[PDB]
């Protein structure tokens, strides 16, 4: 029931010929609605969800101008970070940024986030009060001092408590048929003989939203954790998620095994068995 | 901060001019305001970015141009008398608005209306000296147009601020007329012994901002250029 | 978006406290406000910036602000008033983004007056300038509560009440000036359109 909006920026320098690439993607919970890629022929902010397509040309130009400025500022930030961490024109380097709002009970801000990384590692994060920073080291302390003096925290807080909360609510209303709708997993247990004495039982969970799900096997009410083959939750490519869990069992002993599914879209947690 | 030029400008109705504004703080936003009595500051146009310009409260009669991040010019096309105002440009940051000095602009119907002040010093009443043991000198700067003037008192070649009071606003010699000449008064109060000392020299100086050397002048009378007009008095033993 | 400074002009007695009001109206959840000072010089002087989420109410010398996000009021108090406070004060409101407009109120002109428990009102004739056709009348040493009015006669010029401070002699006083070229103009009639004390000294 709790909702969130997230923006993910990826800024990458090129050792070879070309300008650093800036890519921004926006998400409402597990749904990507927007993208911007500077590497494109003519860089433009684009819709990735049908419900954002109702926004006028002023919304898109406002987005495009924010991202084109961030692209230029990131190329300077990349040039800077390799000056802090004394690096070279030699390698390719990545600045990643994740920020956004969590919707609270009274409709206000529950929590605001702003986290930055350099080369896959934590660099600087905005604290819970939204007035202080936490630098993972010294030199990200250089970034910190530059940001404390330029009152960056106050600018972030204004957006997080303000516009971020207001825009998320608009999206939630505009795409309520999907964003506020939890999709239950379409479940089945498939049987796959491996030998004359063994068979694979695979429990499938398909077409679910959101991505969070639990899938476990039990043998006579006993958890099969160590003997369970569990793939990571994966996108179907149609906005839903897929997942399966498998157990190798003695042939004929199938009825002893139960598959347990828990998902938001399920009225009750499911108990599944192979249906021969 | 913000660098804004010019400080003073006399303009003939129908003439056109461009006010300059520059900021080296790399700010995105630049704004142009006009200040008028009882209206406070009113936004004319603002620029959110280098290629963008958007209308403010009062855009009519003006045009702007955001070329580069530094400059935000304000163009007055066929200047009207209603455009006689004080103009300020601002580029706010995370701390303050960053205002430029301010442009005091006067749009006149004819250059014929431009006059420098007449400056006269009025010596202290002996009746005041006898009653209060104090001596007030009065300075009157009259018949000036435009109202762009700076009054200062000088005692023995040094500018005094002690015992000085200048009217905060000048008076309209004909309030119902729109191109009315202005008048300003100032007082310098001193002790009877200080006024009685003949060594003591008192000078009232009025800096007037008018026409430039480049301006056209077709009238018989002297060209009302930017000038200093003064009047003086010495201490009297009497 | 809107900023309102109801007071056009306020007067204050020297060493006393005064409050300047500002009431704003905004649809923004997050915004910031300013208080600017405009002394007689004409320059705009930064005083304070207060962000919407700021709870920490400030005091800075004889200045103290009160931000009440509830009643949408950002009121400025000047304590132990000094002649240097005589200026025009502006209140401003803006959003945090580049596309947002910084907006100002109509301002409030404050005038600080000396406390005169014992005025010595008098009207004096100053010696004519050899270079002038006019006769000058100085109304001085009146109470700060005296309202100076403009003349009925259009060829008679009357300035408003002005505060001077003779630092050495430690004396503050009020004065108004009346002048004219009119033949019927005299010190005795110069301020006849104004309400002046009955004890006003009229020498010869």
């Amino acid at each position: 029931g709790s909702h969130s909006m997230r923006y993910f920026y990826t800024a990458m320098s090129r050792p070879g010929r070309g300008e650093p690439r800036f890519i921004a993607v926006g998400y409402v919970d597990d749904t990507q609605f927007v993208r911007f890629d500077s590497d494109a022929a003519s860089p433009r902010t684009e819709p990735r969800a049908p419900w954002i397509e109702q926004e006028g040309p002023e919304y898109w130009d406002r987005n495009t101008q924010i991202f084109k400025t961030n692209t230029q500022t990131y190329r300077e930030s990349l040039r800077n970070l390799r000056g802090y961490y004394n690096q070279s024109e030699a390698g390719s380097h990545i600045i990643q940024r994740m920020y956004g709002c969590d919707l609270g009970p009274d409709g206000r801000l529950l929590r605001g986030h702003d986290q930055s990384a350099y080369d896959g590692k934590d660099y600087i994060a905005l604290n819970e009060d939204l007035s202080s920073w936490t630098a993972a080291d010294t030199a990200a302390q250089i970034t910190q001092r530059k940001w404390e003096a330029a009152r960056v925290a106050e600018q972030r807080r204004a957006y997080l408590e303000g516009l971020c909360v207001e825009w998320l609510r608009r999206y939630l209303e505009n795409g309520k048929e999907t964003l506020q709708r939890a999709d239950p997993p379409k479940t089945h247990v498939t049987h796959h003989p491996v030998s004359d004495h063994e068979a694979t039982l695979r429990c499938w969970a398909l077409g679910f939203y959101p991505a969070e799900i639990t899938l476990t096997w039990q043998r006579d009410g006993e958890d099969q954790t160590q003997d369970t083959e569990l793939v990571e939750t994966r996108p179907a490519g149609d906005r839903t998620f897929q997942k399966w869990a498998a157990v190798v069992v003695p042939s004929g002993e199938e009825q002893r095994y139960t598959c347990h599914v828990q998902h938001e879209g399920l009225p009750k947690p499911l108990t599944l068995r192979w249906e021969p | 901060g913000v660098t804004q030029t010019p400080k003073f400008q006399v303009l003939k109705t129908g003439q056109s001019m461009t006010l300059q504004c520059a900021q080296d703080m790399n700010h995105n936003s630049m704004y142009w305001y006009r200040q008028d009595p009882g209206m406070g500051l009113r936004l004319i146009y603002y620029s959110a970015s280098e290629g963008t310009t958007d209308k403010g409260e009062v855009p009519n009669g003006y045009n702007v141009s955001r070329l580069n991040k530094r400059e935000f010019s304000l163009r007055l096309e066929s200047a009207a008398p209603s455009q006689t105002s004080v103009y300020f440009c601002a580029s706010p940051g995370e701390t303050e608005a960053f205002f430029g000095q301010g442009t005091r602009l006067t749009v006149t119907e004819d250059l014929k209306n431009v006059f420098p002040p007449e400056v006269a010093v009025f010596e202290p009443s002996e009746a005041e000296i006898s009653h209060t043991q104090k001596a007030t000198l009065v300075c009157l700067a009259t018949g000036f147009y435009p109202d762009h003037v700076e009054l200062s008192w000088w005692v023995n070649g040094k500018e005094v601020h002690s015992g000085v009071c200048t009217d905060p606003q000048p008076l309209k010699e004909q309030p119902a007329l729109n191109d009315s000449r202005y008048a300003l008064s100032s007082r310098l109060r001193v002790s009877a012994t200080f006024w009685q000392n003949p060594r003591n020299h008192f000078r009232c100086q009025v800096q007037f901002y008018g026409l430039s050397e480049n301006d056209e002048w077709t009238q018989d009378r002297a060209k009302p250029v930017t000038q200093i007009v003064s009047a003086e008095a010495w201490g009297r033993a009497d | 978006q809107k900023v309102t400074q109801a007071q056009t002009e306020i007067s204050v007695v020297e060493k006393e406290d005064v409050t300047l009001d500002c009431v704003y109206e905004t649809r923004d959840t997050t915004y910031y406000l300013f208080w600017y000072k405009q002394p007689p010089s004409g320059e705009l002087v930064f005083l304070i910036r207060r962000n919407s989420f700021d709870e920490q109410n400030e005091i800075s010398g004889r200045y103290s602000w009160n931000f009440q996000k509830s009643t949408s009021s950002f009121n400025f108090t000047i304590t132990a008033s000094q002649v240097v406070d005589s200026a025009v004060y502006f209140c401003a409101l803006s959003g945090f983004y580049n596309t947002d407009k910084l907006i100002f109120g109509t301002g409030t002109r404050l005038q600080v007056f000396p406390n005169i428990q014992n005025p010595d009102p008098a009207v004096y004739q100053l010696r004519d300038s050899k270079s002038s056709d006019k006769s000058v009348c100085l109304f001085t040493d009146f109470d700060s509560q005296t309202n100076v009015s403009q003349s009925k006669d259009s060829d008679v010029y009357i300035t408003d009440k002005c505060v001077l401070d003779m630092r050495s002699m430690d004396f503050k006083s009020n004065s108004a000036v009346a002048w004219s070229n009119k033949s019927d103009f005299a010190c005795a009639n110069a301020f006849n359109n104004s309400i002046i004390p009955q004890d006003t000294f009229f020498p010869s």
Partner: peptide
């Protein structure tokens, strides 16, 4: 909507 630009300079890292 992404974090919009400030009135001032967008501070780099």
């Amino acid at each position: 909507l992404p974090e919009p630009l400030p009135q001032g300079q967008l501070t780099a890292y």
